[PDB]
Amino acid sequence: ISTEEQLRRLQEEKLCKICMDRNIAIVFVPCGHLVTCKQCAEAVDKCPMCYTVITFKQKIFM
Amino acid sequence: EISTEEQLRRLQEEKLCKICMDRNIAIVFVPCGHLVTCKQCAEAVDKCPMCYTVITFKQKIFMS
Ligand code: NI
Ligand SMILES: [Zn+2]
Ligand SMILES: [Zn+2]
Ligand SMILES: [Zn+2]
Ligand SMILES: [Zn+2]
Description:
In chain A, 18% of the residues lie in helices and 13% in strands.
């Protein structure tokens, strides 16, 4: 409910779901999930969230 | 950015389509990688409205 806690929550959402250090920076084609930072995207050939095979790793910019 | 409040506001707003600001980004542009528009707003553009790079694909993304 508090501002700080809402904030902590959104920050935590932005984090790579594999290393949880760096922010997400890659979108998986073709499933379209935002899952990993750039480094961690080197370790995966299938989306961790939906297991779709990744045909391409697009770099993103907000 | 200068207070927890503005930090919150920014993280909340950056989810929003940058054109209409009425709904979440739902498209990433290939090849530039800009996250700019909801599905509706991406319909009209053939170049990214941020960097003007020709768009070869509008990839749907899941952002909540
Ligand atoms: Ni509005
Ligand atoms: Zn990572
Ligand atoms: Zn996926
Ligand atoms: Zn829009
Ligand atoms: Zn662009």
